[PDB]
Structure 1
Amino acid sequence: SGFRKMAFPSGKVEGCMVQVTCGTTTLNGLWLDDVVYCPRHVICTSEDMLNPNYEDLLIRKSNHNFLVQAGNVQLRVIGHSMQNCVLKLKVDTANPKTPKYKFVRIQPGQTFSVLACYNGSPSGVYQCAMRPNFTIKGSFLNGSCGSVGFNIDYDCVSFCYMHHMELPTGVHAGTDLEGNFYGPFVDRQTAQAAGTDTTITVNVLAWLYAAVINGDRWFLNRFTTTLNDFNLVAMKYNYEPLTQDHVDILGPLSAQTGIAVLDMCASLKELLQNGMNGRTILGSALLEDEFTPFDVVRQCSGV
């Protein structure tokens, strides 16, 4: 028993982190087979961030303008190209530590582990969710660009995020590993800001099931609700609408606890309306939305 915000073991990703330098700009890159992936703004100077034309900047570079360092070993760059907002540097050596991997573009509400890295060196690992507003509430300092987010499934690393920037509210924005931003953001300095966010309802319900699995039951009630009356109150509290697909996703947790999904929705309605009255759930005094139904199942009854 017990329930923690657990990240995936990070070793498979650690073996892929490298340092990329162009001019005076250094950031992290991801070295898979004979390719190194990094944010294209490594080719930017201080003068170019306002409105850069990356096609222009890149055509003015050659392979030798890119210094890739993997541990102590320098990797020679033998080709370079741009794909959306990521630069791909072909190197003359395939990473011997390449895991089985794929690139995935995730949906909002999905979770993933971030390996924070500086100068190609991993610093820490933590779990987070893609917010409905396409930002992530990370922990990133100067030099963290190029750090990646990922899930692991039976020894296959699915990479889903590459870090690019910090927004004025202190939340973070970035791309999939094919260089497409999550949300409306662009890699230039503009007035862009996070839109209004919402709470990930299906995840809150998953976490309430985790609490029951772990013996917190105080928030249950004898009531039920219809999906539409529930979605009425969710709209009121800035929660995402719950779909029938969400209900189907929550089926296994419902079956394991004997608590119908719409009954758990009646508990969530009561918690939204009444607060928690000085009590906690799984050691939190707030409703937690960073655990998917799959996260709960993995952690509570699996290995």
Structure 2
Amino acid sequence: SGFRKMAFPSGKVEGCMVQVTCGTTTLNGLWLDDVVYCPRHVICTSEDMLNPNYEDLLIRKSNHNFLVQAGNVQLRVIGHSMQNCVLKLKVDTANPKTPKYKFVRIQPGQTFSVLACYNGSPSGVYQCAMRHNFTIKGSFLNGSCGSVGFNIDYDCVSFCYMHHMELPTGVHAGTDLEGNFYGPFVDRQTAQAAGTDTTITVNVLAWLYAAVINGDRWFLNRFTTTLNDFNLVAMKYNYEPLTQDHVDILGPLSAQTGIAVLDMCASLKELLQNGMNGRTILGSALLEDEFTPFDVVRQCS
């Protein structure tokens, strides 16, 4: 029993984290096989970071301009190239700790683990979700650039996020490992700000099922709603539309608990309309939306 914000074990990722320095600019890199991946922002000097032309900046660099440190061992850079917003530094040594891995891009509403890293040294691990506005509500300080987000499936690390920058609201923006930003952001100083966000409805329902599995039942009721009638209410509260795809994905949790999805939607409707009235669900006084149906099934069974 119990339900926690649970991350994947981070060891397979810790073994790939390195420090990359270009000039006086330093950040974190990801060392897989004989390649180090890092944000291309590392090639900016303080005068470049505002409005850089990255193709110009990279043409002006040599392999010897990049210092890659794996612990107390320098890795010799023998090639460099840029793929969108990530730099690829070919090194003369394959990482012996390379796990089985993939580069996958995730969807808003999906979750991943973040290994926060400073000067190539891992500091902490936490769980977060990609928001509907393609930001993440992370926890990052100066020096965290290049930290990565990932999921683990069996033995395979699926890397899905590399951290670039903090937006004015304190939320975070980054790329997939192909260098393509999540959301309408660029790796330079502009007026960019996060767009409007919504509550991830299917995740809230998954978490209500987690609560029932853990014996929190006070919010259940005898009612069932239609999908259309639920969506009419949920949108008024800035909740994402619930689809038949979402209902289908919640099927296993509905089976384990014996509560149909549209029956649980009637609980959520009442919680939205009435509040929680001084009570809690799984130790929270808010409706939590950063657990996916798969996260709940993984943790509760």
Sort the TM-score into its range (normalised by shorter chain): over 0.9
Corresponding residue number in structure 2 for 1:27: 27
In structure 1, C-alpha distance between the alignment counterparts of 2:227 and 2:185, rounded to whole Å = 34
Corresponding residue number in structure 1 for 2:100: 100
Summarize deviations over 1:207-258 as a string: whole Å, max 9, x none: 0000000000000000011001101111100000011100000000000000
Paired residues in the alignment total 301
- Return the offset for 1:49: 1.8
Secondary structure of 2:106's counterpart equals coil
Aligned structure 1 segments of 4 or more residues deviating by more than 6 angstroms: none
- Return the offset for 1:15: 0.1
In structure 1, C-alpha distance between the alignment counterparts of 2:274 and 2:58, rounded to whole Å = 57
In structure 2, C-alpha distance between the alignment counterparts of 1:62 and 1:23, rounded to whole Å = 11
- Return the offset for 1:51: 1.6
In structure 1, C-alpha distance between the alignment counterparts of 2:268 and 2:44, rounded to whole Å = 48
In structure 2, C-alpha distance between the alignment counterparts of 1:234 and 1:85, rounded to whole Å = 37
- Return the offset for 1:47: 0.9
Summarize deviations over 1:45-91 as a string: whole Å, max 9, x none: 11112221100000000100000000000000000000000000000
In structure 2, C-alpha distance between the alignment counterparts of 1:75 and 1:63, rounded to whole Å = 11
In structure 1, C-alpha distance between the alignment counterparts of 2:233 and 2:21, rounded to whole Å = 51
Secondary structure of 2:185's counterpart equals coil
In structure 1, C-alpha distance between the alignment counterparts of 2:155 and 2:93, rounded to whole Å = 23
In structure 2, C-alpha distance between the alignment counterparts of 1:153 and 1:191, rounded to whole Å = 38
Q: TM-score w.r.t. structure 2 length?
A: 1.00
In structure 1, C-alpha distance between the alignment counterparts of 2:57 and 2:204, rounded to whole Å = 45
Corresponding residue number in structure 2 for 1:51: 51
In structure 1, C-alpha distance between the alignment counterparts of 2:202 and 2:264, rounded to whole Å = 11
- Return the offset for 1:128: 0.2
Secondary structure of 2:247's counterpart equals helix
In structure 1, C-alpha distance between the alignment counterparts of 2:180 and 2:274, rounded to whole Å = 41
Q: Percent identity?
A: 100
In structure 1, C-alpha distance between the alignment counterparts of 2:232 and 2:49, rounded to whole Å = 44
In structure 2, C-alpha distance between the alignment counterparts of 1:266 and 1:151, rounded to whole Å = 32
> Structure 1: any 5+ residue segments left out of the alignment?
none
Corresponding residue number in structure 1 for 2:125: 125
In structure 1, C-alpha distance between the alignment counterparts of 2:65 and 2:49, rounded to whole Å = 19
Summarize deviations over 1:104-127 as a string: whole Å, max 9, x none: 000000000000000000000000
Cα RMSD of the aligned pairs, angstroms, is 0.4
In structure 2, C-alpha distance between the alignment counterparts of 1:40 and 1:189, rounded to whole Å = 14
In structure 2, C-alpha distance between the alignment counterparts of 1:142 and 1:23, rounded to whole Å = 17
In structure 2, C-alpha distance between the alignment counterparts of 1:76 and 1:149, rounded to whole Å = 26
Q: TM-score w.r.t. structure 1 length?
A: 0.99
In structure 2, C-alpha distance between the alignment counterparts of 1:36 and 1:231, rounded to whole Å = 46
In structure 2, C-alpha distance between the alignment counterparts of 1:51 and 1:242, rounded to whole Å = 41
In structure 1, C-alpha distance between the alignment counterparts of 2:208 and 2:201, rounded to whole Å = 11
- Return the offset for 1:152: 0.2
In structure 1, C-alpha distance between the alignment counterparts of 2:49 and 2:142, rounded to whole Å = 15
- Return the offset for 1:298: 0.2
Secondary structure of 2:182's counterpart equals coil
